[model samples]
Target: MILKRAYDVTPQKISTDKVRGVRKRVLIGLKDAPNFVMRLFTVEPGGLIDRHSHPWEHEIFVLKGKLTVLKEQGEETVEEGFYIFVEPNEIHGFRNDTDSEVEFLCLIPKEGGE
Candidate 1:
């Protein structure tokens, strides 16, 4: 079985005009899984992941700190132990307004042939 600490994997820094102070680690993915990929993401205080949407759905579980999730409907605050499910093509974004880092796990289905 594939087993290891999430932090054991090196994180790839993500910074763009829309995204800031974010890092992602691929915990399990295409190389080993045929239909799913799991990732870990960390967002520093004042950081944000700009609004965007994809054709695939994803599930997110908060592990620490607090985060604000923005949707077309409005925004909601999520804390540790909470989970979020984002449907396909649903516009969404995330922000860490608190003075601490936010950590979460995200799982998505792999694309066909990938």
Candidate 2:
């Protein structure tokens, strides 16, 4: 089996007018796995991911800090140790309204029916 540290994987910085102070690490993905891909996201204070939708669903778990998820219906505050599931093609986004960082793990299925 393959094993490695989370921090050992290089993070890709994500910055835009709608998204900021975010970094993503691909823990396991298409190059390594056949069915699913795992990723880790770290959002600094005041950081947020823009609302968007995808064909695939998302299985997310909060690792630390707090995050406010903005949904089409309302907002949900997801705290440490909580889990979130976003259905396919649902409009969703996230924000770290607190002063500390928010870290979470996201797992998604590979495209093309892998």
Model 2, position 29, has a per-residue lDDT of 76
Q: What digit string (tens of lDDT, one per residue) describes model 1 on residues 3-111? A: 7988999998899999999999998879998788889999999989998888888799999999899897789998999999999999999999999999999888987
Angstrom error of the Cα, residue 59, model 1: value is 0.5
TM-score of each: 0.94, 0.93
Please report, as a residue range, the 10-residue window in candidate 1 with the lowest summed lDDT. 105-114
In order, the Cα lDDT scores of the candidates are 0.90, 0.90
Per-residue lDDT of 1-114 in model 2, one digit per residue for the tens?
888999899999999988898999999978888889899999999898989888999999999999899898788898999999999999999999999989999999988232
The reply for model 1, stretches above 4 Å from the true place, is 112-114
Query: Model 2: clashing residue pairs?
Result: none
Model 2 earns a TM-score of 0.93
Name the lDDT value of residue 105 in candidate 2: 96
Clashes of each: 0, 0
| Residue 46 error, candidate 2, Å | 0.4
